[PDB]
Amino acid sequence: KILRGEEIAEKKAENLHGIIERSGLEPSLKLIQIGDNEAASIYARAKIRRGKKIGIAVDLEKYDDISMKDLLKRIDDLAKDPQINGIMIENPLPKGFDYYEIVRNIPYYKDVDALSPYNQGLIALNREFLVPATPRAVIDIMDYYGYHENTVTIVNRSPVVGRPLSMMLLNRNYTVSVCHSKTKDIGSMTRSSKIVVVAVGRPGFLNREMVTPGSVVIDVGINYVNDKVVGDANFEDLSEYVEAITPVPGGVGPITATNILENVVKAAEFQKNNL
């Protein structure tokens, strides 16, 4: 009933270690950060920290200011270095820089954030290669707690969560509904699904009206309100009422960094097998 993530991250990180030591890989991950955004920084350092434990060399390159032309050149150079298995740009970026523009210059087999068109399309086609970390984290919760072949309603249609997630849930036989700010009756869809995945960035959005007693809630929202991080679900309204709910922090959060590192291992292992 409390869907925690850290124990799932620990298991994933153990077998990643195992997979590295086993097949001799020495995966390398480059992280590019522009600006000094504080969420990005914690996320970067978490990937360095778990990387150092798993056996993954993770390096951050911070730039106070960098031009498009320079940044594209840097990425192109990392792209060509066979010593670099994964490349990732941290978010958010400053205005004028389109993430999706930059990211398609990273070979799909190095694209560990897995948001480029090629990885997204491989998911659509049901031939997952690299898959993005939050959607992955959603399914990890479901795999590890025992939810299969259910109706799922996703509240979110962005390319980072909602869309790749619906394609990953279809690959695994779930029945899927996506709704969003243009759905006129969200409550109706969320109450009729076994699972609700919520990501609207809106504290208290998912309350008792939006779910039934059978429901399982996976809260992918991250809101910073009066000095604390909080999800999109009303945890205290819901915990006495739903079947299961991921807390925030402590739900899908702890898994994300490890899922990026999981893509780095897959990237490095495809490069070894295929060049």
Add this chain to the structure above:
Amino acid sequence: KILRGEEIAEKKAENLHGIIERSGLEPSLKLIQIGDNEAASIYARAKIRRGKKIGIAVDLEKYDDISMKDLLKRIDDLAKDPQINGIMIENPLPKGFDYYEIVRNIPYYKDVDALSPYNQGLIALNREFLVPATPRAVIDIMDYYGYHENTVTIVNRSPVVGRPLSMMLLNRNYTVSVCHSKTKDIGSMTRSSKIVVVAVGRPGFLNREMVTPGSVVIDVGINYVNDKVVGDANFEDLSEYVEAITPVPGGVGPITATNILENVVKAAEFQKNNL
């Protein structure tokens, strides 16, 4: 009441002509058929003919027998020729031949069928460039007959229909449910949406029990029964009940070949400017 695609294809065909004149393109499409399949030849010849009417040069190459590794060569050969704007391989292929893996070797900006990873990924990212013909035809009829921003239930999860179509509908603000053979209660989902799209390839699948009077049925199924062709829906049974319904043949069918041609036009415009 009755949602016909012929008028839509002619209006689209004229636009294609307008767009071809106004930029002096000579769009050029290659088609490849392996085998003697009846529906594939019908489809190929439709694109040739509608092509002529329109200003697009479409040329078909048949092969009684081709070696996988010469095919890859001729495809790479059509790729490097800047005089070919569009490449399409006709379905079905022989046993053992993987369509998706041949198609990866067409550059995405020539991939008029639009089922390769890169093009699927662009749909997901709401950056539509070339889109597959059937899902475009669905969105053509919805548009032409005035069904905008609705709830839609898709019964189908294949990369050729349900998957791109779910992403294209979400790009246009529809609320979207995808269900399939592992869904427990299909009718419960089909009844709760204003629009129902079916492509399960089972005659009389969709009947009164699975829709309501408010419903709009778009029938993408193509089945053979008594030699004739029939959809997935019970046309006789639904049309004094449902609000509007596509006939089969005559619904989405008539627009398909022209949607491939629209892709070739778009392919040519893109190439003109990018190279």
